[PDB]
């Protein structure tokens, strides 16, 4: 009977016909669903003079107030004769039009119609409301129309929780050597995970019969599978169903046409759904059809693309029914920087626990995880993935099938098919998987079909596990709130599109319009500025300080905005440069104006100086000021809340305000952006770079003696003359006995690393906290702050991307467990041999001790540790006392896409009593004839790969091919070294080749 008028908006979407509409999908507190339809207008902003002139009048119009319109075109000047920036005031109108309309000098055209809908009717995209039924007329069951949303939506109310329905899916298509093509390859599986409004999970997988034997099909039935002959016969409470391809496909079409809230895949948009759809057209005639909630519009499922250069392409579904088709692969690429975007890597990082041993021996380890084993609920998360996980990875490398599992709400007990090395504790991960589909299809039979079923369901369920892990539901809503956009458009549109809502709201609040009256000349700002450590290896501890949101703070500090730019003064010679600099300082003094040297924009210019007026807060800085404030609010809300559902919501909001603030720098330099401003962007970079150098100049060589911190240079404000005490000698609250010395060791865009001559992590943290305080009170000024993050012990670092250290955090003390930090690496467990590991471990421990002596050039360390390598190496090549064991390496056998490895294992199987089986882990070594001498050439070191089985004995007329191991080893050693020229001379002489340095 009666509609619940209490609704929570969950998506918004549009139909596109000649007769088009905007639709809302909302969820009521009971659980019912209400679609509401609204007429589509196109919005235009005009000046009052244009308004009065209009051919026929607009359908509707609301006044906007007086608004300043400002010319933000950027001009350079070769002297100080800088014309004032053009500026007019006028009453403005927001006009509505049911047809598209060309209005000769309409303004604010960059902003989106949908944004105007929300702003103009006072509707928040994710709001809860008590609808005013007076303004709704029903039209289907469940679908109402609303001519007056401003009044209908007038009673906003607080957020109530709602249930939501999900379908997560994955498919498996047959193939042998080429990538599966819809014209030739059938779908072999379709797996589905349905989460109901109740929270109940339903799992079901359809298996393609036509790829099995009539006997096999009957075995499946006997074994407990259901077999069905048509769509009508499907029973969704059956986890395993066999049917024909056409049935399977008709079943997908039925599911995909349903109005789930979310349909969720990993690369489903470009692969899985494309394949289902095309394969369905092929085998029957049929389309997958979506309909608007009032049945007025019907579209056939058609995947479309969106492009965005700096770059990758994303794929999207064109459903007009309110369902959010969400591809985690696109999303994870937009929201994270990672080395791999393969599902196995993404799973490895996201889902891991610490596993305490319960049994050893046979070919079966066993572990337990719980609150007592890692951290509160880390095992609960792991247990939830295990419900369908088939392969756990142990200790980073040992992939091993599950055998049994016990699961409860907080822990798991799992038994696995691995080797043995039983330390009391080990790390468990759901990552890589030693499965060769191409082989599986080649030998396909019932048991393999069931194995794939188990794999396919797990990939579908990984989509729900990842969806919980990345918090996509709340990120979507936070996105919608903040960007003033439909939930479904939040992770579809790009960074330049999403900034526009909040920007528009600000332009309205500040009664300001920004107009570029010219074609933008071409230049971005980037000059690829990359940062290299003063040295790689650290004997002493290293202090880590982060600037707090440097670039947003730079823009605020300088009042950097396209309209606060007074002008840009350039010079081609030193006389003009000097004259201009002295006129600058008279005409645009501080502190009202800041003047910023930038990298000049033309090759003939020796100087370029952007001048900003800080008297009236500019658009961009105020935007950022809002974003930072809102983030702070939410971080506090996140700690004042206690319900974990609320924590998730406030964490997402907080995150969204981080992301959007961080988008602003790039957007200032991107020419298709509403925030583009060459000078502002360049100036932001320049001011930031200067803050880094200032902080570094001050700490580099700074010392702490008595209770005084002697900074290495005065505390002078680098941009202009200042109120503050520049005295670099500064009272500290540290112990008088402390005597320490500091070195600026690395620094980048937003971070600064300070070596301290001490290994005492307890004291290193005590001092750093005090450095933090003095840096913020005396060194820095206005809104520039750092924060002490952590101490890094045994830092070895190569870049910001590739580094290794033990990290004792700010919270930390001397004796808590560090955090092993690895980054950018590729090795361990049989990429590299025990001879290499044992040598690297030795050559490090000796090098760290050479740095604690203090008695070094670059070259007195370097000569000494390279002499020592020639000695140890020539010794091993002559004395040859090291077991063959020490040079063995591993690998997994599998089929192709690898190629000369198949020839390697084949020939071993073809010539030897044993067979290395197709999912087996086999040892190898670099072996050559003993009559080969020291070799400075090289070749296909693949020829010398020799499978070492259990029988194998080294020929009397064979040797370990030491060179291969040595070259790889001196490589790792010369990248520990700072003297580069010495290292290359060694490597050419010893190996006839030129070494790689990780640049």
Numbering used by the authors: -3 to 306, 314 to 900, 904 to 1005
Give the exact sentences the study uses for this entry:
Here we present the 2.7 Å crystal structure of the full-length VACV DNA polymerase and the characterization of the interface between E9 and its processivity factor subunit A20. E9 crystallized in space group P3121 with one molecule in the asymmetric unit. The structure was solved at 2.7 Å resolution using the MIRAS method. We observed the classical palm, thumb, finger, exonuclease, and N-terminal domains of a family B polymerase in an open conformation. Only 10 out of the 1006 residues could not be modeled. Three poxvirus-specific inserts are clustered on one side of the molecule, corresponding to insert 0 (aa 67–82), insert 3 (aa 572–610), and insert 4 (aa 708–743), whereas insert 1 (aa 208–233) is located on the opposite side. Insert 2 (aa 356–432) is located on the back of E9 in the exonuclease domain and forms a little 6-stranded β-barrel with a greek key fold. The helix of insert 3 forms an important contact as it is bound in a hydrophobic cavity of a symmetry-related molecule mainly comprising residues of the exonuclease domain (i.e., residues 190–200 and 227–233). The temperature factors indicate a high mobility of insert 2 (which appears to be in loose contact with the body of the polymerase) and of the thumb domain. Still, for E9 electron density is visible for all the C-terminal residues.
